C-alpha cells in the first residue's frame, strides 16, 4: 500500500520538505497522443485520416455525371511484430483498406443516377505504425520523429526595430500567415504610404487591392477617414462642432458660440476650454473661409444644372471653386477629417500614388505585376485573384489561424471560415493604421503564445493529404474515359503516390532520424525534443541572437538548461517535465488554484497568455496546515517580472520547483549549486554514457530515476501481474491472480526478456530478471531491468571513492588518475556489438554461390567455417578471418590448351571462380554471436538454415504448450470432480487415462450432458491447439520474398569487450569531464588510517573557477551514505538480532529536518527487514530533489550518525612513502560516467594509401585510411617559423606530386632523404579549368 513490492526491496531516503500536489507525467504521451489522433478514426472530421478523406472526397470528373463516394476505412494487421521487423530489416507497418462506391448519374435525367457499384474495399499504401515506446521501425531501424516549433498561422505586427533608413523613422508592417497558401504584407514607407507585398513580390500600393474588392475611392474615403460636414448657406459658411476631435489646434480667428464669444483667436487651448465649450450646448458656428483652404473634399458633389461636377476626390478646393459650388447649389460640402493630432493622412496619399480606379484596372494591374508574362484577357486576372486568396482549395487558414486572427482583432467569435473575407483585410489595414497613430502596440515574435508545435501525427496527416491530392488528380482524368464496367480498383487507385509520399516523409526527412540508444534517458530526451528547424522552420544562419535566447514565457514549458552548444544553441529545446500541448498546439503548464488566502488542490493548465494574466506564486513559499501562506508578503510573477505581493493577491501557485527543469536536468543532484551554463554541459554529457557490465545505482539521486527507467520502455513491467510461476534468464511466466481475469480460457503472462542485441550506437541492450521464484507481483512492478538499470532505477554510471587533491601532475588540467582496482573489478567495462552482412546475387557470369570450399585458400582459413561455409557460433575472429565463403563465377568460353591443361591437373573450375568472401575488417576483433541466414523462395535452403528453423519452431511450441497444458489440467479437474459426484473410483479412476473411458456412463444425465460436453470441449481444444501450432509452423518456414537480384543474405554479429584505458573520457554529472592520465597500482594510491585506498584522484583546481559546488556536496553526501551502509554491513557481519538492526534502520530513515517521506519499519515484515538491510548493505541510496533538497546541516548530522568527521575531510597517507599529507583531504563517493569517446575509435596513422582521382591528393578520414589535412593556418604557422623546406615537402611530394611521391619513397627506402620536388597536380587541374573558360593562362620561361 504505502510502498510497492519493487520499492520495498530498496527504499531511497528522500530529503523532501515539500508535498507534491500532482505526480509526474509519462513524458512520452505526446508522441503517443499525436499518433493516436492520427491513425485512430473519428465520428467527425476532427481527427484521423478521416479528415483528409473527407477533405478530398467526393471527387467527380468534369461533366462526367460520375462520383466517387467514400465510406469508412480500416487498418490491417501487421505481418511481423517489432522484433521480427527489426531483425529482418523491414518496415513495421499496416495495410490500409478503404471502402468506396462508384455511382453513375443519368445524362438524360438531371440530378438522377442509373448505376451504383459498391464493391468491397481497395488497398493503397502501407501506414507505418509507432511502437509502444513512440518509435517507428522503418527498414529495421528506430527512427524517432522530432516535434517542430513554428509560428502559428494568423496576423502579426512588427516594426523592424525602427532602424532601416537611418533617419530614426520606425516602419510598421502587418503580415498574414495561412496554414497553406500565399502570404500577404502591408508596409509603411518613410513617406507614410500603404504598400502591399503579395507573395513577396514587388511593392504595390494598397489602393489597387482595395479597389479589386469592388471598392470605389469615395466609398474608400468614407471608410478610410471620418468625414466632417461644411455648410455654406447665405454666405455664412458655418462649421459643425466636434469638440472631442478638436483637441490640439490654433484658433485662426475668434470663435463665438451662438453669437457669444467662446474662445478668442489664438487663445491657448486648454482641456478646460474644451470642457467649457462642450458644457455649453452650441449649434453650428461660422468660421473664416480661408481656413477651409487646406481641407480635402471627401465625396463628389454633383451639379444639378449640368453633368459637369467636381469629382476630384483626395483634392483640395480653390477660391474660384467656391463660386462654382455656390452656383451649382451645393449647400453642404463633405470633407474628411484632415486632422493630424492622433490620426494622420493615409490611404488618400496611396490613392494619389496610383490612378487605377476600376476593378478591371486593379485586377489587370495585379495580374501583370505578380505574373510578368502574357497580358490577361479579363479572365486570367479574374481567375488569378480568386486563386491568391479566399479560394477553398488554394488558400486555407487552419482552425488555429482563424482563432488567432479573430483574437488579434478583438472579435467575440472564435470559429469562422478558413478563407479571409472582404472585412478581414479591412480590419487588418485599420489595425495597422491605428498602431502607428498611437493606439495599440507591436507584438513579440518569440513569445511562446505566438509559437505553435507540430508533432508526428499532424505532419503525417499533411503528407497523406499531398498523396491524396496527387492520386485524386489522376483519378479525375480516367472518370472522363471510364465506362460503367470500370471499377474503383480500375478507377486509377494509384497506390504508388500515397505510399511514395508516406515513405518519403517517414524515411528521408529532416525531423526523421535514428533515436540515440546509448542510454534509456538519452532515448527519452530524443523522444521529448522540440526543434525550430525543418521544412516550415528557420535555417541555422537565418536565425539570430534573439531567437536563441531564453524568453520569460519559457518558464514551465521548455527547460532553460538543456540545449546543444555550438551551431544549434537555442534552436533545439526540450519539454519541461510537466509541460503539455494545447489542442490548437500551444504549450501549457499546470498551476494550483488559490481561493481567498488558501491554495486549493485543483489544478489548471495555463498557456503563456493565461499565466501572464494572473499573479502566480512561487513553489518554495511556505504554507500552513489549512493551506494559508505562513508569510503575508510572498514572491510572485505578475507580467514577465517578479516582486512582492500580498498572499490574497496571488491567484495561482507553482505546482513544483522542478516545473522549470527538464527530465534530464531533473537528474542532477544539487543542481541549484551549479552554474546554469556549466549545468548545461552536465545534462548534455549525461546522455552520452554507455552502460557497463553491471548496473550500479546512484548513491545520491533526485528521485526521478524510477520514472525515467519505467517510462522509457527499457525494462519489463508486469502488465497484469499475479504470482511468479517460472523464472529464467530468458523467460518469465506469471500466474495471474484470480481476483481479475478474462472469462474463458483462463490465462497466464509470458515475458521474453531481451538478451544481448545491437543498438543504434553499436552498444549492447540486455535484460535480466529481478524476481526469483514464487514472488508476489502487483500491477506495474518491474520484472526485468534493461541496460543501465538497477532494480527499476536509472543507473548509468558507478560510485567511485574520490579524493580531491593534486597528485604529482597526473591530474593536471582535467586529467583523471585511476587506480588498478577499478580495472581489475571490471567497472567501466562495456560490451560492443557489430553487424556484418554478406549477400549473394545472380550475375551475367551466373549465380553467386556460398560454399565452404574456396579456391586458392589454405585449410587454416577454413578451420572455423561450417559445411555451408559460415563461421561456427562462438568462434573468436580477429584480423581478416573469413566469415562467409562466397565465390562468383568468371566469364570464359575459349578453352586455351593451357587452360585445358590447368583444368586437367587441377579441379574442374581450375580456380576460375573468383573469391568474394566476407572477411573481418582489420582492427575488428569479435566473437561469433548470431547468424541470420535468409533464403529466397524456391532456391535450396541453406544447410545451416534448417537449424535456425528448428530452434524457432522448438521455441514456438515450448512457449505455446503452457496454456494448452493449463487448460487440459483444468478440464481434467472438472472431469474428476464430475466423476467424484457420481461413481467415483478415486485412485482407480485417476490411474486409467481418458478418465477411465469417461467413467462409462453412470447416470443418464451425466453421460448425456456432463461427459459428452467434456469430450466435446476436449476435442475442440485439441483441434484448436493443433491448428494454431500448424499455423505458427507454416509461418516460421516460408520463402523470403527478396529483391529480384538478391539470392541469399547472411548476417553475422560480433561481440567485443572494451577494457577501460587512459585515452578514454570520463565525466561526472556536474559538467566535470576529463580523460584518464594513468592507471596506478593499488599500493601507490592514497589511503586512510584503516588502510582503504581511494579509487580516483581529482584536481581541486577544477572546482573554484568552474563554480561546480554540487561536486563537493555530492561527494560529502556520498561519504555519508556509504558510512551508513558500512554500519549496516558491519551489523550484518556479526549476525546481530533483527530488533536492533531494525532500530538502526528506523533511526537512519527518519533523520532530517521535517522531511515529507515517512517510513516506519513497524508495518514491515521481519523477513522483509532483513532483505531490505541486505539490499542497502553497500550504501543508503539518498534522494535530494532538484531545487528542494538536502542542506549542509542535514548532511552533517547524517555524517555524525555514520560516525564520520563532520567537515567531510579525513587524514590521508602517501602510498609510496607512507607519510601523512599536511592538510586534511576531502574523501567521499561520486557518480562517474564513461562516455562514448574512445582512443581506439580515435587513433589513426597513415604512411601511404589511396588518393583522390581529382587533384591526386590523399583521401580524408579514418575508415578510409586518410591523411590529416594541413590547412591554411598550418601553412601560415610554417611561414611564420621560416621553415621553407618543411612546407615544400608538405605542399609538393607526400601530397600531390605523383612522381615526387614515388621518388621520395624510393630515396627513403635507400636511406637518402632527398626531396627532389616537382609540380602539384592540383595546379595543373586549375590551369585546365581556367583554360576551359575563355581565358588563356600560361607559364612563361
Amino acid at each position: 500500500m504505502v510502498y510497492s513490492y519493487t520499492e520495498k526491496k530498496r527504499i531511497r531516503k528522500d530529503f523532501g520538505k515539500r508535498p507534491q500536489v500532482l505526480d509526474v507525467p509519462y513524458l512520452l504521451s505526446i508522441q503517443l497522443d499525436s499518433f493516436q489522433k492520427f491513425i485512430e478514426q473519428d465520428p467527425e472530421g476532427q481527427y484521423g485520416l478521416e479528415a483528409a478523406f473527407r477533405s478530398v472526397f467526393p471527387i467527380q470528373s468534369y461533366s462526367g455525371n460520375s462520383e466517387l463516394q467514400y465510406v469508412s476505412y480500416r487498418l490491417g494487421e501487421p505481418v511481423f511484430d517489432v522484433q521480427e521487423c527489426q531483425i529482418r530489416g523491414v518496415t513495421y507497418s499496416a495495410p490500409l483498406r478503404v471502402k468506396l462506391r462508384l455511382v453513375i448519374y443519368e445524362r438524360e435525367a438531371p440530378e438522377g443516377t442509373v448505376k451504383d457499384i459498391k464493391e468491397q474495399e481497395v488497398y493503397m499504401g502501407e501506414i507505418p505504425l509507432m511502437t509502444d515506446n513512440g518509435t517507428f521501425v522503418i527498414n529495421g531501424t528506430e527512427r524517432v520523429i522530432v516535434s517542430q516549433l513554428h509560428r502559428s498561422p494568423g496576423v502579426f505586427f512588427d516594426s523592424d526595430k525602427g532602424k532601416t533608413h537611418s533617419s530614426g523613422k520606425v516602419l510598421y508592417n502587418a503580415r498574414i500567415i495561412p496554414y497553406r497558401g500565399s502570404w500577404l504584407d502591408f508596409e509603411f514607407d518613410p513617406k507614410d504610404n500603404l504598400f502591399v507585398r503579395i507573395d513577396r513580390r514587388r511593392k504595390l500600393p494598397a489602393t489597387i487591392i482595395l479597389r479589386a474588392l469592388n471598392y470605389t475611392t469615395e466609398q474608400i474615403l468614407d471608410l478610410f477617414f471620418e468625414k466632417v460636414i461644411f455648410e455654406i448657406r447665405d454666405n455664412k459658411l458655418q462649421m459643425e462642432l466636434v469638440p472631442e476631435r478638436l483637441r490640439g489646434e490654433t484658433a485662426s480667428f475668434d470663435i463665438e458660440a451662438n453669437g457669444k464669444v467662446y474662445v478668442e483667436k489664438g487663445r491657448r487651448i486648454t482641456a478646460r476650454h474644451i470642457r467649457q465649450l462642450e458644457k455649453d450646448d452650441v449649434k453650428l458656428i461660422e468660421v473664416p473661409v480661408e481656413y477651409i483652404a487646406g481641407k480635402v473634399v471627401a465625396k463628389d458633389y454633383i451639379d444639378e444644372s449640368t453633368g459637369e461636377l467636381i469629382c476630384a476626390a483626395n483634392m483640395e478646393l480653390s477660391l474660384d471653386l467656391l463660386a462654382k459650388l455656390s452656383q451649382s447649389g451645393h449647400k453642404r460640402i463633405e470633407t474628411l477629417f484632415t486632422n493630424d493630432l492622433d490620426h494622420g493622412p493615409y490611404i488618400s496619399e496611396t490613392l494619389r500614388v496610383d490612378p487605377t480606379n476600376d476593378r478591371l484596372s486593379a485586377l489587370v494591374e495585379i495580374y501583370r505585376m505578380m505574373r510578368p508574362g502574357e497580358p490577361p484577357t479579363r479572365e486570367a486576372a479574374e481567375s488569378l485573384f480568386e486563386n491568391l486568396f479566399f479560394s477553398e482549395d488554394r488558400y486555407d487558414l487552419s482552425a488555429v489561424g482563424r482563432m488567432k486572427f479573430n483574437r488579434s482583432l478583438l472579435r467575440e467569435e472564435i470559429e469562422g471560415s478558413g478563407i479571409l473575407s472582404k472585412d478581414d483585410i479591412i480590419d487588418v489595414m485599420k489595425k495597422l493604421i491605428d498602431i502607428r497613430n498611437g493606439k495599440g502596440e507591436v507584438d513579440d515574435i518569440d513569445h511562446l503564445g505566438n509559437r505553435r508545435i507540430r508533432s508526428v501525427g499532424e505532419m503525417a496527416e499533411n503528407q497523406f493529404r499531398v498523396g491524396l491530392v496527387r492520386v485524386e488528380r489522376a483519378v479525375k482524368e480516367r472518370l472522363s474515359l471510364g465506362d460503367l464496367d470500370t471499377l474503383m480498383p480500375q478507377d486509377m487507385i494509384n497506390a504508388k503516390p500515397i505510399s511514395a509520399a508516406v515513405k518519403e516523409f517517414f524515411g528521408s526527412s529532416q525531423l526523421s532520424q535514428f533515436m540515440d540508444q546509448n542510454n534509456p534517458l538519452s532515448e527519452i530526451t530524443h523522444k521529448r525534443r522540440i526543434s525550430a528547424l525543418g521544412p516550415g522552420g528557420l535555417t541555422r544562419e537565418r536565425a539570430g541572437f534573439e531567437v536563441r535566447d531564453v524568453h520569460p514565457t519559457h518558464y514551465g514549458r521548455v527547460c532553460p538548461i538543456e540545449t546543444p552548444e555550438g551551431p544549434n544553441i537555442g534552436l533545439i529545446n526540450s519539454l519541461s517535465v510537466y509541460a503539455q500541448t494545447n489542442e490548437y498546439g500551444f504549450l501549457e503548464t499546470p498551476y494550483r488554484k488559490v481561493t481567498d488566502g488558501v491554495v486549493t488542490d485543483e489544478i489548471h493548465y495555463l498557456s503563456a497568455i493565461e499565466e501572464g494574466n494572473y499573479v502566480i506564486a512561487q513553489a518554495n513559499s511556505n504554507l500552513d496546515e489549512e493551506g494559508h501562506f505562513v508569510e503575508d508578503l510572498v514572491t510572485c510573477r505578475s507580467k514577465g517580472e517578479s516582486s512582492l505581493f500580498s498572499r490574497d493577491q496571488v491567484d495561482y501557485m507553482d505546482v513544483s520547483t522542478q516545473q522549470v527543469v527538464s527530465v534530464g536536468a531533473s537528474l542532477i543532484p544539487f543542481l541549484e549549486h551549479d552554474d546554469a551554463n556549466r549545468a548545461l554541459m552536465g545534462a548534455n554529457m549525461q546522455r552520452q554514457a554507455v552502460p557497463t557490465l553491471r548496473a550500479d545505482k546512484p548513491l545520491v539521486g533526485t528521485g526521478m530515476e524510477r520514472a525515467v527507467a519505467v517510462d522509457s520502455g527499457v525494462t519489463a513491467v508486469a502488465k497484469r501481474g499475479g504470482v511468479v510461476q517460472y523464472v529464467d534468464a530468458s523467460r518469465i511466466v506469471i500466474k495471474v491472480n484470480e481476483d481479475e481475469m478474462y472469462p474463458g480460457e483462463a490465462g497466464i503472462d509470458i515475458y521474453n526478456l531481451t538478451k544481448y542485441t545491437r543498438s543504434n550506437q553499436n552498444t549492447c541492450i540486455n535484460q535480466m530478471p529481478c524476481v526469483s521464484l514464487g514472488e508476489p507481483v502487483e500491477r506495474g512492478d518491474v520484472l526485468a531491468d534493461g541496460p543501465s538499470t538497477d532494480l527499476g532505477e536509472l543507473a548509468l554510471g558507478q560510485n567511485m571513492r574520490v579524493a580531491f587533491m593534486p597528485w604529482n601532475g597526473y591530474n593536471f588540467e582535467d586529467s583523471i588518475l585511476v587506480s588498478e582496482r577499478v580495472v581489475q573489478e571490471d567497472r567501466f567495462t562495456t560490451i560492443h556489438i557489430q553487424e556484418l552482412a554478406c549477400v549473394s546475387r545472380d550475375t551475367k557470369l551466373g549465380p553467386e554461390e556460398i560454399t565452404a570450399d574456396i579456391p586458392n585458400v589454405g585449410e587454416a582459413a577454413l578451420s572455423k567455417l561450417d559445411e555451408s561455409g559460415i563461421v561456427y557460433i562462438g568462434a573468436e575472429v580477429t584480423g581478416g578471418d573469413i566469415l562467409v565463403g562466397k565465390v562468383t563465377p568468371k566469364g570464359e568460353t575459349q578453352l586455351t590448351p593451357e587452360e585445358k591443361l590447368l583444368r586437367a591437373i587441377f579441379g574442374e573450375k581450375a580456380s576460375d571462380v573468383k573469391d568474394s568472401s566476407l572477411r573481418v575488417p582489420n582492427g575488428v576483433s569479435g566473437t561469433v554471436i548470431d547468424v541470420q541466414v535468409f533464403t529466397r523462395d524456391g532456391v535450396e535452403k541453406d544447410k545451416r538454415a534448417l537449424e535456425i528453423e528448428e530452434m524457432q519452431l522448438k521455441q514456438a511450441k515450448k512457449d505455446l504448450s503452457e496454456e494448452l497444458q493449463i487448460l487440459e489440467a483444468g478440464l481434467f479437474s472438472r472431469i474428476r470432480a464430475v466423476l467424484v459426484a457420481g461413481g467415483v473410483e478415486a485412485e482407480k479412476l485417476d490411474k486409467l487415462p481418458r478418465d477411465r473411458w469417461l467413467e462409462l456412463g453412470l447416470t443418464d444425465e451425466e453421460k448425456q450432458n456432463q461427459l459428452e460436453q467434456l469430450a466435446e470441449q476436449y476435442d475442440e481444444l485439441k483441434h484448436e491447439f493443433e491448428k494454431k501450432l500448424e499455423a505458427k509452423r507454416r509461418k516460421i518456414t516460408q520463402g523470403d520474398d527478396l529483391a529480384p537480384g538478391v539470392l541469399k543474405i547472411v548476417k553475422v554479429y560480433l561481440a567485443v569487450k572494451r577494457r577501460i584505458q587512459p585515452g578514454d573520457k570520463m565525466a561526472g554529472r556536474h559538467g566535470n569531464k576529463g580523460v584518464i592520465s594513468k592507471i596506478n597500482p593499488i599500493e601507490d594510491m592514497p589511503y586512510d588510517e584503516n588502510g582503504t585506498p581511494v579509487d580516483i584522484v581529482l584536481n581541486p583546481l577544477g572546482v573554484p573557477s568552474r563554480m561546480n559546488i554540487g561536486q563537493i556536496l555530492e561527494t560529502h553526501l556520498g561519504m555519508a551514505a556509504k558510512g551508513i551502509g558500512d554500519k549496516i554491513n558491519a551489523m550484518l557481519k556479526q549476525q546481530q538480532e533483527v530488533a536492533k538492526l531494525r532500530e538502526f534502520i528506523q533511526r537512519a530513515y527518519d533523520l532530517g529536518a521535517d522531511v515529507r517521506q515517512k517510513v516506519d519499519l513497524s508495518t514491515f515484515s521481519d523477513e522483509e527487514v532483513m532483505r531490505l538491510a541486505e539490499n542497502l548493505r553497500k550504501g543508503m541510496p539518498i534522494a535530494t530533489p532538484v531545487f528542494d533538497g538536502a542542506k549542509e546541516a542535514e548532511i552533517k548530522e547524517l555524517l555524525k550518525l555514520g560516525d564520520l568527521p563532520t567537515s567531510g575531510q579525513i587524514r590521508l597517507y602517501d602510498g609510496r612513502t607512507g607519510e601523512q599529507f599536511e592538510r586534511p583531504v576531502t574523501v567521499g563517493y561520486m557518480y562517474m560516467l564513461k562516455l562514448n569517446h574512445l582512443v581506439d575509435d580515435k587513433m589513426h596513422a597513415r604512411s601511404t594509401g589511396s588518393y583522390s582521382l581529382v587533384t591526386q591528393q590523399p583521401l580524408g578520414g579514418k575508415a578510409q585510411f586518410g591523411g590529416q589535412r594541413f590547412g591554411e593556418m598550418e601553412v601560415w604557422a610554417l611561414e611564420a617559423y621560416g621553415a621553407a623546406y618543411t612546407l615544400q615537402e608538405m605542399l609538393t611530394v607526400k601530397s600531390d606530386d605523383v612522381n615526387g611521391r614515388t621518388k621520395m619513397y624510393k630515396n627513403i627506402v635507400d636511406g637518402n632523404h632527398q626531396m627532389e620536388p616537382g609540380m602539384p597536380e592540383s595546379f595543373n587541374v586549375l590551369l585546365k579549368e581556367i583554360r576551359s573558360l575563355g581565358i588563356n593562362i600560361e607559364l612563361e620561361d
Binding site: 529482418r88 530489416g89 505578380m370 502574357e374 549477400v839 586458392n856 591437373i905 580456380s911 589511396s1250 583522390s1252
Partner: protein, 380 residues
C-alpha cells in the same frame, strides 16, 4: 519483402567543388611496378622490367613472347640473354610465379623457393613438372613405370603438385565490381505468366523535371514566361523515356508470349526465334528490336537472365519441322552427363541417339556442341 539486405557502402566527396572526385585502386601491374621501383635495377634493366610488366595479364602470366620483348626494345646488347635474367628477377616477386611464360614455368619457379629438404621436392621438382606433364594431366598410371617409382609415393607427389598455386598473380587482384544486375524486366508466374517493367523511374523523372524546369518557368520572378526554354524540354524528355519504355515492354511481351514454353515445365523448350518473328509481331524493323534486346535483362524464377538467349536460330533440319540447338545443347549435356562410367558419348553414337529421338543433326554438329562447353569422355 520478407527480408531486406542492408544498404551497400557508398560514398561521395563532401566539402569539395568537383563532387564525387574519385579514388585510386591497386592492380596487379600497379603492384608489380611498385616492386620494380624498389629493387636495384639499371636504366636499361628498368626499361626491360617495364616492358615485360606491361605484358602481364590479369592472371599474372606473360602473354607476349620473350623474343617479342627483345624486338620491342630494339636496342643493341639487349638480347634474350639479359631479358631472361630480368624476367626471372621479376618472376621472383611477391606473387611468386607471376609473369611466367607458361604453366610449367609457374610450377618450376614456385618449387625453386622451398626448404630444399621437402619430403618430395626433387621427386616433383622436374620429374613431374618439367617432364611428363601430360601424363600428370591424365591418370599417370604409366608414369609410375616411367619415373621408376611406386604409385604410393606419386600419390603424394601429385598432392604437392596440387599444393603449388595454379595461377599466381590473381590473389593480389581485388575484385570490387560484382557486376550485379538490376533485372529491369521482372516477370512472375501466374495463370498465364504475366510480365512487368520495373526500374522505369519515368514518374520520378517526370516529377523532378517538372519541379525543376516547369518550377522555374512557373516562378514569376523572371520577366515574361519560360514556356519554351525548359517547359518544352521536359516534355521531350518524358516522351523519349516513355517511348523507350513502351518499346522495351512490347518487345519483351512478344518474347515472353513466344517462349512461354521455356518457362513452363522444363527449361529446354526454346523455339528458334528469329529477329523477323518478333519484327512481324510488333510490326517494326528487326534492327530496332535487336538493338533493344542486346543488354536488357529479365528476372526469372528459374529462367536464364538474358533476352538474346531466346533467338536460337537453329532449325537444324530437325525431323518434324524445326528445333533449337540450345535446347539440343541442353539435351546433349544431360545425355552425356548421365552415362556409364566408361561414358563413350561418341559423336557418331550421340548423333545417332539424337536422330532416334527425332533430331536429325549431323555427326559433326553434335561435336561442336559438346566442345563448346565440355570435353569428350574418352570418346577417342
Amino acid at each position: 519483402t520478407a527480408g531486406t539486405p542492408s544498404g551497400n557502402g557508398v560514398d561521395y566527396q563532401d566539402d569539395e567543388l568537383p563532387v564525387y572526385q574519385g579514388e585510386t585502386t591497386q592492380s596487379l601491374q600497379d603492384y608489380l611496378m611498385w616492386q620494380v621501383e624498389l629493387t636495384p635495377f639499371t636504366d636499361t634493366d628498368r626499361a626491360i622490367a617495364t616492358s615485360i610488366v606491361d605484358a602481364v595479364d590479369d592472371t599474372g602470366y606473360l602473354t607476349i613472347q620473350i623474343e617479342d620483348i627483345v624486338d620491342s626494345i630494339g636496342d643493341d646488347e639487349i638480347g634474350l640473354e639479359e631479358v631472361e635474367a630480368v624476367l626471372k628477377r621479376i618472376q621472383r616477386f611477391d606473387p611468386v610465379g607471376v609473369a611466367a611464360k607458361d604453366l610449367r614455368d609457374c610450377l618450376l619457379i614456385q618449387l625453386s623457393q622451398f626448404a630444399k629438404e621437402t619430403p618430395w621436392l626433387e621427386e616433383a621438382r622436374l620429374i613431374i613438372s618439367d617432364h611428363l606433364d601430360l601424363l600428370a594431366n591424365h591418370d599417370f598410371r604409366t608414369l609410375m613405370r616411367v619415373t621408376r617409382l611406386k604409385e604410393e609415393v606419386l600419390k603424394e607427389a601429385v598432392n604437392l603438385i596440387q599444393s603449388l598455386d595454379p595461377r599466381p598473380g590473381q590473389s593480389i587482384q581485388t575484385g570490387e565490381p560484382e557486376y550485379v544486375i538490376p533485372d529491369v524486366l521482372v516477370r512472375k508466374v501466374n495463370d498465364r505468366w504475366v510480365v512487368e517493367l520495373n526500374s522505369d523511374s519515368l514518374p520520378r523523372l517526370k516529377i523532378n523535371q517538372q519541379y525543376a524546369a516547369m518550377g522555374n518557368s512557373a516562378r514569376n520572378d523572371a520577366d515574361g514566361q519560360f514556356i519554351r526554354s525548359n517547359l518544352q524540354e521536359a516534355r521531350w524528355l518524358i516522351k523519349s523515356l516513355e517511348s523507350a519504355n513502351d518499346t522495351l515492354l512490347r518487345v519483351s511481351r512478344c518474347i515472353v508470349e513466344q517462349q512461354q514454353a521455356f518457362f513452363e515445365q522444363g527449361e529446354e523448350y526454346m523455339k528458334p526465334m528469329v529477329l523477323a518473328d518478333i519484327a512481324q509481331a510488333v510490326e517494326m524493323h528487326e534492327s530496332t528490336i535487336s538493338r533493344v534486346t542486346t543488354q536488357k535483362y529479365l528476372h526469372s524464377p528459374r529462367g536464364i537472365f538474358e533476352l538474346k538467349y531466346f533467338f536460337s536460330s537453329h532449325v537444324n533440319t530437325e525431323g518434324g519441322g524445326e528445333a533449337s540447338s540450345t535446347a539440343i545443347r541442353a539435351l546433349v549435356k544431360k545425355l552425356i552427363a548421365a552415362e556409364n562410367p566408361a561414358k563413350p558419348l561418341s559423336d557418331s553414337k550421340l548423333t545417332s541417339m539424337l536422330s532416334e529421338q527425332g533430331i536429325m543433326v549431323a555427326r559433326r554438329t553434335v561435336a561442336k556442341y559438346r566442345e563448346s562447353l565440355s570435353i569428350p569422355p574418352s570418346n577417342q
